[PDB]
């Protein structure tokens, strides 16, 4: 009975890995980029201040 | 064909997607839309001709899809970039104006504009 | 990795902890009654 | 001792991993996993500053956070194919709910005196319905005592039972003759869809607990 | 239901409420402030 | 004896009907959310807290019904 | 206040960054005195 | 200033940055963190003022 | 025996009453969401009135529920 | 005897059904209040005494029904 | 035993009534979606996550009726 | 036995009631479609997929009900 | 005997199911009339939609009807 349930869970992880796992990778990547760009922007900014 | 016009300019006098801010909330017109008369409230307006999109800040006016597929939009002033900091300074003043003060109603309109600015 | 900065708000959670104690005693008596019939 | 005790330990160790190696030693730049625990932080920052905003909102920010994460983890672990009733052991969940409700009632009485009973005067309604509106405000106030617990518990319990009941039925579909074993996968796909829904509603319920026991606390801290 | 009626109600419940107190402290002193390091670090980076 | 056990299971079936009301209720609240957003897209942040609150409050009554059912069913 | 007066006040407010041409400025403020009349008799001019 | 400009260019953790590195070069980090935990406010504007703040809601 | 059966049956029938409350609460909250989308600004006044309405609608359902416990337990 | 006593409990359960309409009734009054007030911002002072009258009346049918449920059960 | 077993099968049928509320419910959420999108032409990016959220929750209450129904039917 | 056999045929009948809700539900989705396309003719290409989707989901709740009916009829 | 009585009773219960379908058909048609009256011109696109909507609503009604027939006839 419960081997049917375990089969359902295997299917569940299959769908998750199919659709969600690349999506969550892309989502996480997008944010990571944004944080990095802001960080690097701040570095540029203080370099400007020295020159000023 | 879309028509967009101001007293002192003409902007589009159909055009693929138009997004309009109205008494009835927000209304969208895409190709043929059924014939409406809607008063445009003080607004943020988008007009798209193909995928190209132009963004307009609109002082309210009137919208009328004509039954001949002429979307007559008439409003007092439309570029959203032109409207965009001096307005923030004004917004402080407008809050001050509400405090002392038809003038009361005017200051209320200024509050409406302040909301309209917050969208920008 | 791990870092600890104490937040002394454990005396802010005094009514929460007190409620837990009252229920422990009352649930002890209830548990004894339910473990019979 | 109990099976339950072993799985409560498993929950603790899972939660530790979310702030010990989900973190990249605490990288400012942020890692793909640690970005997740930033977003959870932000939507509870903006939720519990939003609910129980006021002079104190951060003072109850750890409490609402450990109510989020506990339920968030305990409705994934309990959704593993062999894994025990923790949230389907309703007696722990409902008890925790009543404890928090009492810890609100006591917090309100203590912090806001005997004018805490003004919470159960909803408004200055006309005098002939003032006593009625005290009675069925206190009644609804201790309907809040049990509602919060019964929400989470019922959702999780019903989900596991639905999946199991259908699993046993489709077992007997694939035990009867081969013309039924052809079209034996079609009900199975329904169980798969249900398992997707049950994972979803456990996270939705996880948000709903933590907003409701922010809402009760909103009522309790700020009178009326 | 055997999952809602053991005789172990208080035993289970003891281990349960212990997990809550543990997690509360654990978040409050440890894990919440390491996120607050991210917040503060960002504000110092904001200053520079 | 059988009469008692029968009546228990009958009483359980009957109670379960109460959940339907909450099922319609949830839909009504979410319908309102969708309509509100479409009529003012900038409403979205103000409505969202109220929406989750309203969902929960609607749901609870159906779950009260379900609890009476479980009181009979599980005993 | 009329509907178009309502819109008018909004339009004037809307003319606030600066970039504002003369036609805008004229469209924002204008001077006129509406001279109310009765029957001959004249409630004396007051700024529009 | 010439020297300081050079110091920013040839050493700068920004292609890998851990809070341990900022805590180590500035204990101002930990001082502010501790003051915030003491303050009992876990919203700090500085995180959302240029650095992101995406949130479910 | 028959008396025991009778209380179980009566308890069942009363529980159906909760149905009205589940719809009721939703109608108040729907109107709240609709009202706030109509005004953009009403919410401060309206939200108290709405919570009052919620309570009153809920109270009717609670009458059904307490009747159910009075039947079932006695 | 057994039948008469039984009929009290069963009859009471059946009696409890009427309450659902009044519950819905109250919600309808409050819905109209919210909706109207959102249109005006200011009708509310006029509308509030009217609304309380409406509440009491919608509620009342439920109370008559509830009374019958107690009369049937206890009496 | 025949009485108790008959009571199980009947009680299941009674529980089945509860599903109807959810059935209307799904449609109500979708009706709001269709109307809302028709209002805006373009709201759909915002609204579609809300629509799925509403659908799942309404359905879930329905499923609670169903799990009780099958608990009686098979069990 | 007569009691059990009766229970199957009776219980089936009770289940059939749930389907009424689904009938209304389907119609609601179609009503929204008609009004929606009516309000903006060119909304159709987005909306027609949504309409068939809404139909299917509403129908699915109905399916679960109908399954319980057939189970009581035939096993 | 009891089973034959039960066939007739059961059949009756199934007849109740039909009320919903009657409402369903009307709702599709009400929308048709409203839509057409709104446009004067959407009708040709909408008319196949309306027929489809009728059919599907009706189909649920048919299921109620056939279950009744099985119970009546045996």
PDB file of N, CA, C and O in Angstrom, chain D residues 111-159:
ATOM      1  N   UNK D 111      -0.245  43.739  30.864  1.00  0.00           N
ATOM      2  CA  UNK D 111       0.291  44.933  30.262  1.00  0.00           C
ATOM      3  C   UNK D 111      -0.737  46.017  30.182  1.00  0.00           C
ATOM      4  O   UNK D 111      -0.390  47.194  30.159  1.00  0.00           O
ATOM      5  N   UNK D 112      -2.030  45.639  30.119  1.00  0.00           N
ATOM      6  CA  UNK D 112      -3.090  46.560  29.801  1.00  0.00           C
ATOM      7  C   UNK D 112      -4.197  46.364  30.775  1.00  0.00           C
ATOM      8  O   UNK D 112      -5.349  46.644  30.470  1.00  0.00           O
ATOM      9  N   UNK D 113      -3.839  45.891  31.987  1.00  0.00           N
ATOM     10  CA  UNK D 113      -4.642  45.933  33.185  1.00  0.00           C
ATOM     11  C   UNK D 113      -5.967  45.252  33.083  1.00  0.00           C
ATOM     12  O   UNK D 113      -6.123  44.239  32.406  1.00  0.00           O
ATOM     13  N   UNK D 114      -6.958  45.827  33.797  1.00  0.00           N
ATOM     14  CA  UNK D 114      -8.311  45.341  33.823  1.00  0.00           C
ATOM     15  C   UNK D 114      -9.077  46.078  32.767  1.00  0.00           C
ATOM     16  O   UNK D 114     -10.245  45.783  32.533  1.00  0.00           O
ATOM     17  N   UNK D 115      -8.390  46.974  32.012  1.00  0.00           N
ATOM     18  CA  UNK D 115      -8.968  47.655  30.882  1.00  0.00           C
ATOM     19  C   UNK D 115      -8.585  46.808  29.685  1.00  0.00           C
ATOM     20  O   UNK D 115      -8.914  47.117  28.545  1.00  0.00           O
ATOM     21  N   UNK D 116      -7.999  45.608  29.942  1.00  0.00           N
ATOM     22  CA  UNK D 116      -7.892  44.523  29.007  1.00  0.00           C
ATOM     23  C   UNK D 116      -9.275  44.027  28.679  1.00  0.00           C
ATOM     24  O   UNK D 116      -9.519  43.586  27.564  1.00  0.00           O
ATOM     25  N   UNK D 117     -10.232  44.109  29.640  1.00  0.00           N
ATOM     26  CA  UNK D 117     -11.590  43.673  29.401  1.00  0.00           C
ATOM     27  C   UNK D 117     -12.333  44.662  28.530  1.00  0.00           C
ATOM     28  O   UNK D 117     -13.426  44.364  28.053  1.00  0.00           O
ATOM     29  N   UNK D 118     -11.734  45.849  28.255  1.00  0.00           N
ATOM     30  CA  UNK D 118     -12.223  46.793  27.280  1.00  0.00           C
ATOM     31  C   UNK D 118     -11.949  46.298  25.882  1.00  0.00           C
ATOM     32  O   UNK D 118     -12.532  46.810  24.935  1.00  0.00           O
ATOM     33  N   UNK D 119     -11.046  45.297  25.704  1.00  0.00           N
ATOM     34  CA  UNK D 119     -10.817  44.627  24.438  1.00  0.00           C
ATOM     35  C   UNK D 119     -12.057  43.881  24.036  1.00  0.00           C
ATOM     36  O   UNK D 119     -12.314  43.695  22.849  1.00  0.00           O
ATOM     37  N   UNK D 120     -12.905  43.508  25.023  1.00  0.00           N
ATOM     38  CA  UNK D 120     -14.056  42.690  24.738  1.00  0.00           C
ATOM     39  C   UNK D 120     -15.263  43.576  24.791  1.00  0.00           C
ATOM     40  O   UNK D 120     -16.386  43.094  24.731  1.00  0.00           O
ATOM     41  N   UNK D 121     -15.038  44.909  24.779  1.00  0.00           N
ATOM     42  CA  UNK D 121     -16.035  45.890  24.462  1.00  0.00           C
ATOM     43  C   UNK D 121     -15.531  46.304  23.108  1.00  0.00           C
ATOM     44  O   UNK D 121     -14.474  46.924  23.052  1.00  0.00           O
ATOM     45  N   UNK D 122     -16.152  45.975  21.985  1.00  0.00           N
ATOM     46  CA  UNK D 122     -15.546  46.205  20.688  1.00  0.00           C
ATOM     47  C   UNK D 122     -15.575  47.674  20.361  1.00  0.00           C
ATOM     48  O   UNK D 122     -14.587  48.177  19.830  1.00  0.00           O
ATOM     49  N   UNK D 123     -16.693  48.363  20.666  1.00  0.00           N
ATOM     50  CA  UNK D 123     -16.887  49.734  20.289  1.00  0.00           C
ATOM     51  C   UNK D 123     -17.927  50.267  21.223  1.00  0.00           C
ATOM     52  O   UNK D 123     -18.486  49.534  22.039  1.00  0.00           O
ATOM     53  N   UNK D 124     -18.164  51.598  21.156  1.00  0.00           N
ATOM     54  CA  UNK D 124     -19.248  52.251  21.845  1.00  0.00           C
ATOM     55  C   UNK D 124     -20.505  52.173  21.032  1.00  0.00           C
ATOM     56  O   UNK D 124     -21.012  53.187  20.552  1.00  0.00           O
ATOM     57  N   UNK D 125     -21.082  50.949  20.946  1.00  0.00           N
ATOM     58  CA  UNK D 125     -22.315  50.657  20.251  1.00  0.00           C
ATOM     59  C   UNK D 125     -23.414  51.129  21.172  1.00  0.00           C
ATOM     60  O   UNK D 125     -23.137  51.257  22.365  1.00  0.00           O
ATOM     61  N   UNK D 126     -24.637  51.413  20.725  1.00  0.00           N
ATOM     62  CA  UNK D 126     -25.768  51.741  21.582  1.00  0.00           C
ATOM     63  C   UNK D 126     -25.917  50.806  22.757  1.00  0.00           C
ATOM     64  O   UNK D 126     -25.615  49.622  22.615  1.00  0.00           O
ATOM     65  N   UNK D 127     -26.326  51.345  23.923  1.00  0.00           N
ATOM     66  CA  UNK D 127     -26.348  50.645  25.182  1.00  0.00           C
ATOM     67  C   UNK D 127     -27.191  49.389  25.189  1.00  0.00           C
ATOM     68  O   UNK D 127     -26.771  48.480  25.902  1.00  0.00           O
ATOM     69  N   UNK D 128     -28.326  49.206  24.492  1.00  0.00           N
ATOM     70  CA  UNK D 128     -29.062  47.950  24.556  1.00  0.00           C
ATOM     71  C   UNK D 128     -28.386  46.761  23.915  1.00  0.00           C
ATOM     72  O   UNK D 128     -28.908  45.664  24.101  1.00  0.00           O
ATOM     73  N   UNK D 129     -27.248  46.916  23.197  1.00  0.00           N
ATOM     74  CA  UNK D 129     -26.548  45.767  22.671  1.00  0.00           C
ATOM     75  C   UNK D 129     -25.129  45.778  23.165  1.00  0.00           C
ATOM     76  O   UNK D 129     -24.321  44.972  22.712  1.00  0.00           O
ATOM     77  N   UNK D 130     -24.784  46.648  24.147  1.00  0.00           N
ATOM     78  CA  UNK D 130     -23.483  46.617  24.787  1.00  0.00           C
ATOM     79  C   UNK D 130     -23.227  45.329  25.548  1.00  0.00           C
ATOM     80  O   UNK D 130     -22.153  44.772  25.331  1.00  0.00           O
ATOM     81  N   UNK D 131     -24.093  44.768  26.399  1.00  0.00           N
ATOM     82  CA  UNK D 131     -23.762  43.548  27.118  1.00  0.00           C
ATOM     83  C   UNK D 131     -23.671  42.335  26.237  1.00  0.00           C
ATOM     84  O   UNK D 131     -22.904  41.432  26.561  1.00  0.00           O
ATOM     85  N   UNK D 132     -24.484  42.270  25.157  1.00  0.00           N
ATOM     86  CA  UNK D 132     -24.462  41.176  24.215  1.00  0.00           C
ATOM     87  C   UNK D 132     -23.129  41.063  23.534  1.00  0.00           C
ATOM     88  O   UNK D 132     -22.590  39.971  23.387  1.00  0.00           O
ATOM     89  N   UNK D 133     -22.580  42.222  23.120  1.00  0.00           N
ATOM     90  CA  UNK D 133     -21.318  42.370  22.440  1.00  0.00           C
ATOM     91  C   UNK D 133     -20.128  42.209  23.346  1.00  0.00           C
ATOM     92  O   UNK D 133     -18.994  42.244  22.876  1.00  0.00           O
ATOM     93  N   UNK D 134     -20.333  42.046  24.672  1.00  0.00           N
ATOM     94  CA  UNK D 134     -19.244  41.679  25.536  1.00  0.00           C
ATOM     95  C   UNK D 134     -19.213  40.189  25.574  1.00  0.00           C
ATOM     96  O   UNK D 134     -18.137  39.593  25.522  1.00  0.00           O
ATOM     97  N   UNK D 135     -20.407  39.556  25.648  1.00  0.00           N
ATOM     98  CA  UNK D 135     -20.548  38.124  25.738  1.00  0.00           C
ATOM     99  C   UNK D 135     -20.012  37.430  24.514  1.00  0.00           C
ATOM    100  O   UNK D 135     -19.248  36.474  24.633  1.00  0.00           O
ATOM    101  N   UNK D 136     -20.375  37.903  23.303  1.00  0.00           N
ATOM    102  CA  UNK D 136     -19.986  37.213  22.097  1.00  0.00           C
ATOM    103  C   UNK D 136     -18.740  37.835  21.529  1.00  0.00           C
ATOM    104  O   UNK D 136     -18.427  37.609  20.363  1.00  0.00           O
ATOM    105  N   UNK D 137     -18.018  38.672  22.314  1.00  0.00           N
ATOM    106  CA  UNK D 137     -16.660  39.036  21.993  1.00  0.00           C
ATOM    107  C   UNK D 137     -15.721  38.204  22.802  1.00  0.00           C
ATOM    108  O   UNK D 137     -14.704  37.761  22.278  1.00  0.00           O
ATOM    109  N   UNK D 138     -16.046  37.915  24.087  1.00  0.00           N
ATOM    110  CA  UNK D 138     -15.194  37.053  24.874  1.00  0.00           C
ATOM    111  C   UNK D 138     -15.277  35.635  24.368  1.00  0.00           C
ATOM    112  O   UNK D 138     -14.299  34.900  24.424  1.00  0.00           O
ATOM    113  N   UNK D 139     -16.466  35.230  23.865  1.00  0.00           N
ATOM    114  CA  UNK D 139     -16.698  33.925  23.301  1.00  0.00           C
ATOM    115  C   UNK D 139     -15.857  33.681  22.093  1.00  0.00           C
ATOM    116  O   UNK D 139     -15.296  32.605  21.925  1.00  0.00           O
ATOM    117  N   UNK D 140     -15.777  34.700  21.215  1.00  0.00           N
ATOM    118  CA  UNK D 140     -14.964  34.656  20.032  1.00  0.00           C
ATOM    119  C   UNK D 140     -13.522  34.830  20.354  1.00  0.00           C
ATOM    120  O   UNK D 140     -12.666  34.494  19.546  1.00  0.00           O
ATOM    121  N   UNK D 141     -13.206  35.378  21.545  1.00  0.00           N
ATOM    122  CA  UNK D 141     -11.843  35.582  21.921  1.00  0.00           C
ATOM    123  C   UNK D 141     -11.293  34.269  22.355  1.00  0.00           C
ATOM    124  O   UNK D 141     -10.118  34.016  22.131  1.00  0.00           O
ATOM    125  N   UNK D 142     -12.111  33.389  22.969  1.00  0.00           N
ATOM    126  CA  UNK D 142     -11.610  32.077  23.285  1.00  0.00           C
ATOM    127  C   UNK D 142     -12.099  31.099  22.276  1.00  0.00           C
ATOM    128  O   UNK D 142     -11.888  29.901  22.437  1.00  0.00           O
ATOM    129  N   UNK D 143     -12.706  31.559  21.159  1.00  0.00           N
ATOM    130  CA  UNK D 143     -12.731  30.698  20.007  1.00  0.00           C
ATOM    131  C   UNK D 143     -11.412  30.800  19.300  1.00  0.00           C
ATOM    132  O   UNK D 143     -10.979  29.853  18.651  1.00  0.00           O
ATOM    133  N   UNK D 144     -10.680  31.917  19.519  1.00  0.00           N
ATOM    134  CA  UNK D 144      -9.360  32.127  18.982  1.00  0.00           C
ATOM    135  C   UNK D 144      -8.362  31.246  19.654  1.00  0.00           C
ATOM    136  O   UNK D 144      -7.301  30.966  19.105  1.00  0.00           O
ATOM    137  N   UNK D 145      -8.708  30.755  20.864  1.00  0.00           N
ATOM    138  CA  UNK D 145      -7.862  29.893  21.634  1.00  0.00           C
ATOM    139  C   UNK D 145      -7.622  28.601  20.922  1.00  0.00           C
ATOM    140  O   UNK D 145      -6.503  28.095  20.944  1.00  0.00           O
ATOM    141  N   UNK D 146      -8.680  28.032  20.299  1.00  0.00           N
ATOM    142  CA  UNK D 146      -8.594  26.723  19.703  1.00  0.00           C
ATOM    143  C   UNK D 146      -8.489  26.786  18.207  1.00  0.00           C
ATOM    144  O   UNK D 146      -8.057  25.809  17.595  1.00  0.00           O
ATOM    145  N   UNK D 147      -8.874  27.914  17.564  1.00  0.00           N
ATOM    146  CA  UNK D 147      -8.884  27.971  16.118  1.00  0.00           C
ATOM    147  C   UNK D 147      -7.512  27.845  15.528  1.00  0.00           C
ATOM    148  O   UNK D 147      -7.327  27.143  14.542  1.00  0.00           O
ATOM    149  N   UNK D 148      -6.519  28.530  16.131  1.00  0.00           N
ATOM    150  CA  UNK D 148      -5.172  28.613  15.623  1.00  0.00           C
ATOM    151  C   UNK D 148      -4.496  27.280  15.567  1.00  0.00           C
ATOM    152  O   UNK D 148      -3.702  27.014  14.666  1.00  0.00           O
ATOM    153  N   UNK D 149      -4.790  26.407  16.548  1.00  0.00           N
ATOM    154  CA  UNK D 149      -4.153  25.124  16.640  1.00  0.00           C
ATOM    155  C   UNK D 149      -4.801  24.203  15.683  1.00  0.00           C
ATOM    156  O   UNK D 149      -4.143  23.410  15.011  1.00  0.00           O
ATOM    157  N   UNK D 150      -6.137  24.310  15.584  1.00  0.00           N
ATOM    158  CA  UNK D 150      -6.907  23.368  14.837  1.00  0.00           C
ATOM    159  C   UNK D 150      -6.710  23.604  13.372  1.00  0.00           C
ATOM    160  O   UNK D 150      -6.858  22.685  12.579  1.00  0.00           O
ATOM    161  N   UNK D 151      -6.357  24.842  12.965  1.00  0.00           N
ATOM    162  CA  UNK D 151      -6.006  25.109  11.599  1.00  0.00           C
ATOM    163  C   UNK D 151      -4.848  24.310  11.081  1.00  0.00           C
ATOM    164  O   UNK D 151      -4.975  23.600  10.083  1.00  0.00           O
ATOM    165  N   UNK D 152      -3.694  24.379  11.777  1.00  0.00           N
ATOM    166  CA  UNK D 152      -2.515  23.695  11.316  1.00  0.00           C
ATOM    167  C   UNK D 152      -2.668  22.217  11.383  1.00  0.00           C
ATOM    168  O   UNK D 152      -2.257  21.487  10.483  1.00  0.00           O
ATOM    169  N   UNK D 153      -3.207  21.749  12.524  1.00  0.00           N
ATOM    170  CA  UNK D 153      -3.337  20.347  12.779  1.00  0.00           C
ATOM    171  C   UNK D 153      -4.192  19.638  11.797  1.00  0.00           C
ATOM    172  O   UNK D 153      -3.815  18.578  11.308  1.00  0.00           O
ATOM    173  N   UNK D 154      -5.352  20.236  11.453  1.00  0.00           N
ATOM    174  CA  UNK D 154      -6.304  19.614  10.574  1.00  0.00           C
ATOM    175  C   UNK D 154      -5.751  19.502   9.201  1.00  0.00           C
ATOM    176  O   UNK D 154      -5.963  18.493   8.539  1.00  0.00           O
ATOM    177  N   UNK D 155      -5.030  20.545   8.741  1.00  0.00           N
ATOM    178  CA  UNK D 155      -4.507  20.554   7.406  1.00  0.00           C
ATOM    179  C   UNK D 155      -3.518  19.441   7.195  1.00  0.00           C
ATOM    180  O   UNK D 155      -3.620  18.677   6.237  1.00  0.00           O
ATOM    181  N   UNK D 156      -2.553  19.312   8.121  1.00  0.00           N
ATOM    182  CA  UNK D 156      -1.500  18.343   7.983  1.00  0.00           C
ATOM    183  C   UNK D 156      -2.021  16.936   8.111  1.00  0.00           C
ATOM    184  O   UNK D 156      -1.637  16.059   7.339  1.00  0.00           O
ATOM    185  N   UNK D 157      -2.942  16.705   9.075  1.00  0.00           N
ATOM    186  CA  UNK D 157      -3.487  15.403   9.380  1.00  0.00           C
ATOM    187  C   UNK D 157      -4.294  14.877   8.237  1.00  0.00           C
ATOM    188  O   UNK D 157      -4.176  13.715   7.853  1.00  0.00           O
ATOM    189  N   UNK D 158      -5.104  15.764   7.630  1.00  0.00           N
ATOM    190  CA  UNK D 158      -5.977  15.415   6.551  1.00  0.00           C
ATOM    191  C   UNK D 158      -5.194  15.080   5.325  1.00  0.00           C
ATOM    192  O   UNK D 158      -5.599  14.213   4.560  1.00  0.00           O
ATOM    193  N   UNK D 159      -4.049  15.770   5.108  1.00  0.00           N
ATOM    194  CA  UNK D 159      -3.229  15.549   3.944  1.00  0.00           C
ATOM    195  C   UNK D 159      -2.624  14.186   3.902  1.00  0.00           C
ATOM    196  O   UNK D 159      -2.683  13.504   2.880  1.00  0.00           O
TER     197      UNK D 159
END
